[PDB]
Design a protein around this nucleic acid. Structure first.
Ligand SMILES: [Zn+2]
Lengths: 53, 98, 70, 65, 141, 171, 104
RNA sequence: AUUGACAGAUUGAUAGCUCUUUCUCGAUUCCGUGGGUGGUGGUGCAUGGCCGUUCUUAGUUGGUGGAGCGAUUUGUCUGGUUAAUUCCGAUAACGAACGAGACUCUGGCAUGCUAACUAGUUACGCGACCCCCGAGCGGUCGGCGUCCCCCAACUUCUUAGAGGGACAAGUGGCGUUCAGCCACCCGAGAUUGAGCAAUAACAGGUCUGUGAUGCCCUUAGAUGUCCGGGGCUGCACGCGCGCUACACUGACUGGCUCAGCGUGUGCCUACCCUACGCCGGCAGGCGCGGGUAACCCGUUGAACCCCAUUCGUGAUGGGGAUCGGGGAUUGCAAUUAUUCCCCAUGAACGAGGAAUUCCCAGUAAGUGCGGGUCAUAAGCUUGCGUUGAUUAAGUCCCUGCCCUUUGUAC
């Protein structure tokens, strides 16, 4: 019963995940974005990040 | 009419008080943000609402791993029958506009 | 280090030229300025040159990383 | 070995002179600033360029049509 | 003629010597055995190195005050051959910079300033400035 | 309570919120005439302005859906009670929004007006509505089961340059 | 009250920010007192560089995303009511105005 | 009805998983069927979206006219010109559209303006302290550390706004004395470098980024999920990006001495950056402080470089692979060595066949330092500066591309 989710999920790309896609590879951790780099590009402009050069 | 009563029936009351309800699509949340009277986790919430929808007593919108549950008129009626509540009641939709 | 020198090198010889202009006389300034330039233009005028930015796909700016092919 | 003006220069400059030969002049910086007054240009460089070709055309005009 | 006015290389030499002639610094018991950082393949060749480091330490403190051990490491820093992987900075030895600072404390060359670290001390300021005068009166060269 | 997170962090986070919202509103109110959201925080209030064509639809029965959404925004994004409100504004000239028409075209495709005649229609509409010019591209499997694309187009366009960052609206 | 209030404007956009500060300085002059010009901080870039792709396989290219973040700020020697009248004006954009009471 | 259970056997397991026995929510259940739902299952040759590539070049399009039975063509061109289908001009074309350019960010000029205790201060005043701090008999100087507030004085340096600023504008050549090209003056000399970027494609990649998704498969003895354990690190072998080298223009050992871009806790699920003081050779340990930051880290006291050391052409102190012994931290756990330090060990390699890569100005190359991932963390990458060249300024030999005419049995 209790061992269902009993493995320490404190750290590492197991634990942390995206705030959209929820996949766990290419998390833009910086500035606490925490989205899939794909997701990042998808929302960039709305988030405010903007390609100047 | 399912599983632990106290938990379920506390959900159903929360679904009446606010018209709406949200979760976070996340099984392993031994609390639930809001509610949080006693354990009553995310899920139990999540799987009750999913029944509600299935028998046609609440609508949906997903958006960014979360869940949102706008509640139907047919849904409201079902809860007031289930919670054996009065015909006046006021769920949430009342609010003075101007 | 080397830059810093090249800056002060500029600095004082500019500053002198500035001093002469403002307090001495503009005939003297010109006399000096000539004697600095005929040696080197850098003693007064700056190098607009500055470190050119790297673009991805190479270690630096103009250089690219090695292409493999086969 | 580089700078040719585009038609967006050469039209504007041609037209400007057709309409403001009078106010325009050989002295560049005067007619650099004329072109700001009489014409609504969006950018600085284009303004500055137009005025150039204007001063190139003022030079030709002073020497037959 | 203050110390800034002098060729700092040939200064620390006479400073160390000064510190040797006085003969009351406090060189620890390791000295011989210890490396001097994780940088270094080896220990120093100059066996009386401690006298030299103290000097450099005091002469830094004359220049930039309020400089703790951490400060001293970063100053006494440099390259770290990692062999077959590429090179990096390594911070110098904490303890040797701590012991030097505690040795100059015991001399009363230095003192722990408010806002942390060490500043070299008046009686100290004397000595460094004194030997600057010495070097400047070595010869016209 | 008295956190005060970093300016580098704060501005990022807020954009994220505004973005995550738009999505939710796009999923919810697309069929219901949606065209955008405009948030503006104030002293002790966070007035958030929806954009739409069918305003009466999003407001609902005697006012109801706006009350539902506000509650959900309150619930979801961690907003205290009465520190938020969803104002629905009628969009000026719906034609000259891209996402509005992109929705319209999407609706029409789902209803079963043919790919060509609906599209053509949408383009003619935004043209009449006074657009500089336009590009409508529909991709995927138009008749059969091999991929293809249409590209119904008219009038003055751009692609390159900075201008496009502001001169075209794309959806 | 007179105690040295400090206003702190910050924005992702500049022109909007520079309009705002100008509107508060004008307001400070109208109700004449004191100000010390809008003190530019060095504006920070938030820089992300991601691969253009999803997946790994084209030629390798990079999006070079930015999000510059500007900070102005203004001193002031005045009571609270005058400040609240000023700051209630100049709101609508995405400027983050922060008013600190005195000293720090 | 038939959800959930200490034993004790079993089990890997303190899995009520199973067998023996308990007792339990009390309306959950179990069985069918319909039917779901999920899936980092299959399909990118079923699709969307997004990339990449064609294709970094100058290219691309319809309207209306003219030409052809037509497919088509003309416009979109002999010539000169340009980085440019960029212009001048010619003209069954006329007038338009996209690209290109303009544009955006950037870099370099502003003793001019607006500006500041989260910049400097800035030179002053030196109001000083301060001790002989020094020179000096003593005054007057030199040097900073700083101690300074505000009722000093600003904005050279600093930050960053708004303006300005160069346009081939000026002079001389060459050019239908057009478009332009060359040179030189003044001063940046049209040329700082990126970003964006057409039409039509490709059955390029992606269904393992997505609660984008068709079909198909599975769906309780699971291809759902979770827990343990292993594996993706396995080594006759072959290849691709890489680092470190082969030393003396070097190595060590001391000493002196200068950066710039950033980043940082109090978080979306548990933690940052770290000064100072003690403990330890060291890796690190333990105490107190500052920092949501031009406020603290942090005058970021970086490396190479410079200056003295020794060594002495010896696989030598070049090199630091391999392996033994111990010690530190990260962690729930590090054995198949997580990283880190110490001693010891001391391999190939003495510049590399045929082949081929990348590159022309603050560039290559050297050199370090940031960001990314990140409990632990770079031989990678994405940025930063520091040191700083040789050689060209041209041509189509090769490799390719763009236009013209030509031939084509493709
Ligand atoms: Zn996503």
């Amino acid at each position: 019963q209790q061992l269902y989710w009993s493995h320490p999920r404190k750290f590492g790309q197991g634990s942390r995940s995206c705030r959209v896609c929820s996949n766990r590879h290419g998390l833009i951790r910086k500035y606490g974005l925490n989205m899939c780099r794909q997701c990042f590009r998808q929302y960039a402009k709305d988030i405010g990040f903007i390609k100047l050069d | 009419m399912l599983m632990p009563k106290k938990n379920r029936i506390a959900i159903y009351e929360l679904l009446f008080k606010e018209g709406v309800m949200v979760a976070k699509k996340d099984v392993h949340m031994p609390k639930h943000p809001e509610l949080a009277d006693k354990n009553v986790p995310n899920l139990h919430v999540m799987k009750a609402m999913q029944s509600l929808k299935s028998r046609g007593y609440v609508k949906e919108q997903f958006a960014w791993r979360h869940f949102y549950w706008y509640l139907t008129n047919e849904g409201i009626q079902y809860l007031r029958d289930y919670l054996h509540l009065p015909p006046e009641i006021v769920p949430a939709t009342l609010r003075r506009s101007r | 280090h080397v830059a810093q020198i090249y800056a002060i090198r500029q600095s004082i010889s500019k500053a002198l030229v500035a001093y002469y202009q403002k307090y001495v006389d503009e005939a003297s300034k010109k006399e000096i300025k000539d004697i600095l330039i005929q040696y080197d233009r850098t003693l007064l005028v700056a190098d607009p040159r500055r470190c050119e930015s790297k673009k991805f796909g190479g270690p630096g700016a103009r250089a690219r990383y090695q292409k493999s092919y086969r | 070995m580089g700078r040719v003006r585009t038609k967006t220069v050469k039209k504007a400059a041609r037209v400007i002179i057709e309409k403001y030969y009078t106010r325009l002049g050989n002295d560049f910086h005067t007619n650099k600033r004329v072109c700001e007054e009489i014409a609504i240009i969006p950018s600085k460089k284009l303004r500055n360029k137009i005025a150039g070709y204007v001063t190139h055309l003022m030079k030709r005009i002073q020497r037959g049509p | 003629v203050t110390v800034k006015d002098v060729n700092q290389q040939e200064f620390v030499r006479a400073l160390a010597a000064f510190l040797k002639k006085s003969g009351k610094l406090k060189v620890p018991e390791w000295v011989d055995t210890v490396k001097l950082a994780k940088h270094k393949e080896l220990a120093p060749y100059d066996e009386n190195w401690f006298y030299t480091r103290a000097a450099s330490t005091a002469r830094h403190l004359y220049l930039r005050g309020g400089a703790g051990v951490g400060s001293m490491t970063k100053i006494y820093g440099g390259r770290q051959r990692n062999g077959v992987m590429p090179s990096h900075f390594s911070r110098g030895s904490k303890s040797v910079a701590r012991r030097v600072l505690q040795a100059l404390e015991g001399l009363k060359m230095v003192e722990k300033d408010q806002d942390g670290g060490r500043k070299l001390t008046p009686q100290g300021q004397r000595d460094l400035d004194r030997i600057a005068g010495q070097v400047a009166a070595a010869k016209k060269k | 309570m008295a956190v005060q997170i970093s300016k580098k962090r704060k501005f990022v986070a807020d954009g994220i919120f505004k973005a995550e919202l738009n999505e939710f509103l796009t999923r919810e109110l697309a069929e219901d005439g949606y065209s955008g959201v405009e948030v503006r925080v104030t002293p002790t209030r966070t007035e958030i302005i929806i954009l739409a064509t069918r305003t009466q639809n999003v407001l609902g029965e005697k006012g109801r859906r706006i009350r539902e959404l506000t509650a959900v925004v309150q619930k979801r994004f961690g907003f205290p009670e009465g520190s938020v409100e969803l104002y629905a504004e009628k969009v000026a000239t719906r034609g000259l929004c891209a996402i509005a028409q992109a929705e319209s075209l999407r609706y029409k495709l789902l209803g079963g007006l043919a790919v060509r005649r609906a599209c053509y229609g949408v383009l003619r509409f935004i043209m009449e509505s006074g657009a500089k010019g336009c590009e409508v591209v529909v991709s995927g499997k138009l008749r059969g089961q091999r991929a293809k694309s249409m590209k119904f187009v008219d009038g003055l366009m751009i692609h390159s340059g900075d201008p496009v960052n502001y001169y075209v609206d794309t959806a | 009250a007179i105690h040295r209030i400090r206003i702190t404007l910050t924005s992702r956009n500049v022109k909007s920010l520079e309009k705002v500060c100008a509107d508060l300085i004008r307001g400070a002059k109208e109700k004449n007192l004191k100000v010390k010009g809008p003190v530019r901080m060095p504006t920070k870039t938030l820089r992300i560089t991601t691969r253009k792709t999803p997946c790994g396989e084209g030629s390798k290219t990079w999006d070079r995303f930015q999000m510059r973040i500007h900070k102005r700020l203004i001193d002031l020697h005045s009571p609270s009511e005058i400040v609240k009248q000023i700051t209630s004006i100049s709101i609508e954009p995405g400027v983050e105005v922060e008013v600190t009471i005195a000293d720090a």
